[PDB]
């Protein structure tokens, strides 16, 4: 029994992926979600849509209640979460218009509530140390990639394909993301430092959303939308809000295609053991037990 939650970020404040059947305003032990949750179906698969920054985009990346958002989806019966993340490219072969199915990240966030467990009154009791070597649900990752293939969107795998075979616009089959706290964009100094470390893209919204999803025993995968080259290139042109929004509008049609096709693909498989494994991993990470 699968149900897919969808979290839309920058340039995707109103995903609008289906005819809305119902609307839930929920509360969690960790506070209220960013907005009301919109429910509907993709085929026979139940689906929930939630704007990360609220309908009017009034909530900045660092102030988003990631716990409430993830836990609200969990309470509504979601087994999977597909998320969108606008980003800047730190590499030549990743160009505006491309998408990246992330498989790795580096965390530079702070001051965000990043765990459901702890000793404070507003947390679940216990100490939870989750393994995060491969922080995403690999099965869900491959579904996003396969969804791109089915909708005739180019896929580039750096490990099996030459760079001359990278056909833009394309969905990159892997990549690492540095997550900064924001709300400001990076300096040129920080950009080149991130490049030197071999990172692929830079964003503000991936962490702790990906971490909390695993804590919730949910299968999570991110589709990163490349909207710019950050600021490591020429003055014409470095990243700004207008640039991010402009490119995202150009790419949003392919984003909806991939997501809708992904939800259908997830509902076409059995996830019994994977869900078992997701829950068992959480229990085995409790050190207080």
């Amino acid at each position: 029994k699968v149900k897919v939650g969808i979290i839309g970020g920058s340039g995707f404040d109103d995903p609008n992926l289906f005819k809305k059947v119902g609307v839930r305003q929920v509360t969690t032990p960790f506070g209220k979600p960013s907005d009301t949750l919109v429910e509907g179906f993709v085929g026979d698969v139940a689906c929930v849509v939630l704007p990360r920054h609220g309908k009017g985009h009034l909530i900045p990346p660092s102030e988003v209640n990631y716990r409430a958002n993830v836990w609200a989806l969990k309470d509504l019966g979601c087994t999977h979460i597909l998320a969108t993340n606008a980003c800047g490219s730190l590499q030549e072969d990743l160009v505006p218009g491309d998408f990246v199915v992330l498989n790795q990240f580096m965390d530079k966030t702070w001051g965000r509530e990043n765990t459901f467990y702890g000793s404070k009154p507003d947390s679940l009791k216990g100490v939870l140390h989750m393994p995060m070597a491969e922080p995403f649900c690999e099965r869900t990752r491959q579904i996003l990639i396969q969804a791109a293939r089915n909708k005739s969107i180019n896929v580039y795998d750096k490990k099996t394909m030459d760079k001359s075979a990278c056909i833009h616009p394309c969905v990159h089959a892997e990549g690492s993301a540095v997550t900064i706290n924001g709300p400001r964009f990076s300096t040129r100094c920080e950009s080149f430092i991130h490049k030197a470390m071999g990172l692929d893209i830079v964003n503000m919204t991936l962490v702790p959303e990906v971490s909390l999803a695993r804590e919730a025993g949910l299968s999570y995968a991110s589709i990163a939308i490349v909207t710019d080259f950050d600021c490591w290139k020429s003055e014409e042109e470095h990243v700004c809000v207008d640039m991010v929004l402009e490119q995202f509008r150009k790419s949003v049609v392919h984003v909806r295609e991939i997501l809708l096709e992904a939800v259908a693909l997830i509902g076409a498989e059995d996830w019994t053991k994977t869900i078992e494994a997701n829950k068992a991993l959480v229990m085995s990470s409790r050190q207080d037990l």
Copy 2:
């Protein structure tokens, strides 16, 4: 017309740049500034002076209300902000006594209020994503450098001069700064890591002051005072409070000379377009309005 705000940090708790014409204690949407603001004139140019840590230096770098300080300067009508920052050198050619007109930074601060905008009652409403590729006002940067030339202080530009032209004490025409949260100084491990990343100096007070200045639509430039070699050199001697204060007292006369001349140079030019551009950049970065 222009009005230049001046913020003094470590070793500069009492700038004393002029005779006070007025004295102001203001409230701000983000709290109280570090201390009373001092109003006056440098020649015919209006100025406002504000110590970053208070006159008694009781407020540590991580607890300074950068929001209130910058916003207070904005409300009083400041168009520019000149700021001083004590720092340790991570490079051979930057030695104690030198100064750096920074052009870049890397942020390693945390737990500081770094933006005026958000969804909390403690902030203005909206979501602001400012560009920070070149985080300083370039025109104001060049004025600091020119001010040093006018006061017969050596100026070293690594991009146009050979290393032989690096004569100390000198003002470096460019440089990057890593801003650590403090209050402790860095370990040797951290020092060499910052050094390997290619950073020029390390400080505790630059960020988020520079970021907030741009958010407020102000032209901001920093002059960093190199007081030590951090701790990547010999045990005699590694950075400590006494070392920092000792060098800063030796360097404070050149600092005041540069600032006063810079204020005069600012008042000699027209800034209508730059100020317009600064303000328009704010509104164009409001994603909630877009």
Copy 3:
């Protein structure tokens, strides 16, 4: 007169080093310590034991009241603190079972109270900028190392020895630690990034414990217990709670042996000048004065 406090972390919530002669529950100007402080003797040397995470390990690394723990030990009259820290290795020469007498660290923590001094009501008045070039008490470090020698445990000093002399299990005479906030473990991306920076181990509990100890004028030394290779090696296996606890159980007998000998060796020497130097360093770091 010396008094050695011992802070036990992961895999060492119950050090059990001596017969309980007394117990203190205290309230400190910065709040309550993690647990009751147990008092006794190692030979003729006064000793105090305090579990960093509480007896039931209910307090996560980021929520530990390091200020209260250190200050409570200071108020009992402790002159020294010996601490244990579970960690993952980032380098080939450091394998599970090895111990490391740390001499350096890189801080990547956030949201932790890392100083006793400030302008907030819950802090001591003043501005304290402590030198931290070599953050540990060197005399106390050498005692930990000598304690290992006394117990016929291999000691590997990479500065005076060859790579062929690195015989496992061994106590490394030096090492650098990156301290992450947790509670999650690192991603492979982060693991390789830390590795490329030349760091030896990764942990969650060293900072700000070491920093506050120096602020309090106490001699502090950490012995790190390598329980895994983090996640930069083979998929079978990467770090998890079960792996950490399993290896620590295999090492705990030797950890206790070293600590007991260390406490005795401390009490056998005169620390009058060192103690004065510890106090003087704090006073010289007050910028407000």
